[PDB]
Structure formats: structure tokens, C-alpha cells
């Protein structure tokens, strides 16, 4: 939980 900071560069691949 808490404040999530995203780095879209490191998204997991779609499957």
C-alpha cells in the first residue's frame, strides 16, 4: 500500500 510511483519504462510485457 501507500503512494505508488510508476516507471512506465519498466512495465512487464503483455502476454
Amino acid at each position, epitope marked *: 500500500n501507500g503512494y505508488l510511483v*510508476l516507471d512506465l*519504462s519498466m512495465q512487464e510485457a503483455l502476454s
Partner: antibody, heavy 114, light 110 residues
Framework: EVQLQQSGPVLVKPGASVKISCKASGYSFTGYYMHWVRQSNGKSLEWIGRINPYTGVPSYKHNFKDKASLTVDKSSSTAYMELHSLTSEDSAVYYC???????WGQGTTLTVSS | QAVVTQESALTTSPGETVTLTCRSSTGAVTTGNYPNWVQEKPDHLFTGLIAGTNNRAPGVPARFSGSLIGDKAALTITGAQTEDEAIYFCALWFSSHWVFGGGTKLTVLG
């Protein structure tokens, strides 16, 4: 819409320092990392580092650790990169990018020359 | 140490399909390298295309798609358009930093 507005071109002399800005608009600034990238003629694209705007923690590529300092102003939703001990080899176009495969700033051309 | 290599230049025609590849000197490229792809148009105009192997950025036409082909990352343009004439860079993640490929100049014969 998202906008990453960088500061304008700058000419400085060797040995000085410069602070480049990147004003983020159109999204939650503290909800995403910010990356910094350098484009030179002789070295092409190099990743400088990224910064977590919520925690303020920066991460650097090893070769930029003593060259660049990344900071943010949460109040204005602006990311900053300060370059130290400038040499002619630091002349390049510098970009901020929320993600490498996404939104990029327009670039800031830095000329370091005596 | 980790060097990323792309094709220097490629040529295709409008309506055709072209594939750009992105390889690593240290080993095979996998989803753990989180391949990102970005397009550069003249005058330093960068537009992100693909993040995390195959997550297409919002607003990017569907003709752009990312994948892994064998031991390399790949950007496929299905039905290339003349406005796709540009330079395309890949970036790979190596544990604690990103490394960009040298870029591929793509010609779409107009």
C-alpha cells in the same frame, strides 16, 4: 495533455555549472519517475539517470554520478538536472522523459566553449 | 561493457511491413531488459513508441508493435506510412542503468 517543457538553450564557459529545468504538465508529477538523457554527436544517446519525484531519491549511471545532480520541486512540478565542472565534451542536447518509450521533453541544447 | 546494436539503415515502401531488431553484446534480450523504443524526427523531436517490450504508448498508431524475436528485441511496423521515415532507437535495462542502441535510419520511399 502531457507537456514536458524544458528550459532554453544555454552557452557557458568550461569549468562552470548549469541547471536545466523540465516542467511537467498534464499528469500527476509525483506519480511517475523522470528520466534524463544526453544526445551528443560522438556518443549518440546516453542515459544519465532517473529521479523519484515523491521520495526525491535519484539514481545515476555510474559515469554521470559526479557530473549530474537530479532534484525536483514538488510545488511547481519541475524536475532539475545540474551539471558540474563543464567541459567541451559536455556540449550536447539534454532531454527529460517521463519514460523512454513515452513522453519526452523538447530538449535543451547546451554549448560549452571558451 | 553492455553494448546495444541496431541495423544502421533500413528501407521499406508504403503499405509494407518492416522489422527493426535490437541485440545485446552480453547475452540474449529478454523481458528483464524491458525494451523501450523511441522515434526521432528531424530537429530533435523524440516520440516514445513502445515500453516494457510491447506496451504501446498512448496515441501511437497500432501499426507499431514491439516483441522479442529469438534473442533480440524487435519493433515491427505493419503497413508503413511515409511519415514513418525517421530514426528509431531501442533502449535496454541492465540491472541498474539503461543502454541505447545506435539507432536505425528507416526510409519509407515517398
Amino acid at each position: 495533455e502531457v507537456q514536458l517543457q524544458q528550459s532554453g538553450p544555454v552557452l557557458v564557459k568550461p569549468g562552470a555549472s548549469v541547471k536545466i529545468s523540465c516542467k511537467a504538465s498534464g499528469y500527476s508529477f509525483t506519480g511517475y519517475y523522470m528520466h534524463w538523457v544526453r544526445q551528443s554527436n560522438g556518443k549518440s544517446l546516453e542515459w544519465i539517470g532517473r529521479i523519484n519525484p515523491y521520495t526525491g531519491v535519484p539514481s545515476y549511471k555510474h559515469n554521470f554520478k559526479d557530473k549530474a545532480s537530479l532534484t525536483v520541486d514538488k510545488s511547481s512540478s519541475t524536475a532539475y538536472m545540474e551539471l558540474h565542472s563543464l567541459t567541451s565534451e559536455d556540449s550536447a542536447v539534454y532531454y527529460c522523459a517521463r519514460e523512454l518509450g513515452g513522453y519526452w521533453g523538447q530538449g535543451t541544447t547546451l554549448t560549452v566553449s571558451s | 561493457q553492455a553494448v546495444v546494436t541496431q541495423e544502421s539503415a533500413l528501407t521499406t515502401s508504403p503499405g509494407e511491413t518492416v522489422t527493426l531488431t535490437c541485440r545485446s553484446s552480453t547475452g540474449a534480450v529478454t523481458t528483464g531488459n524491458y525494451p523501450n523504443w523511441v522515434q526521432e524526427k528531424p530537429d530533435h523531436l523524440f516520440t516514445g513508441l513502445i515500453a516494457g517490450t510491447n506496451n504501446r504508448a498512448p496515441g501511437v498508431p497500432a501499426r507499431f508493435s514491439g516483441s522479442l524475436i529469438g534473442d533480440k528485441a524487435a519493433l515491427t511496423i505493419t503497413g508503413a506510412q511515409t511519415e514513418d521515415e525517421a530514426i528509431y532507437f531501442c533502449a535496454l535495462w541492465f540491472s541498474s542503468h539503461w543502454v541505447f542502441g545506435g539507432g536505425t535510419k528507416l526510409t519509407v520511399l515517398g
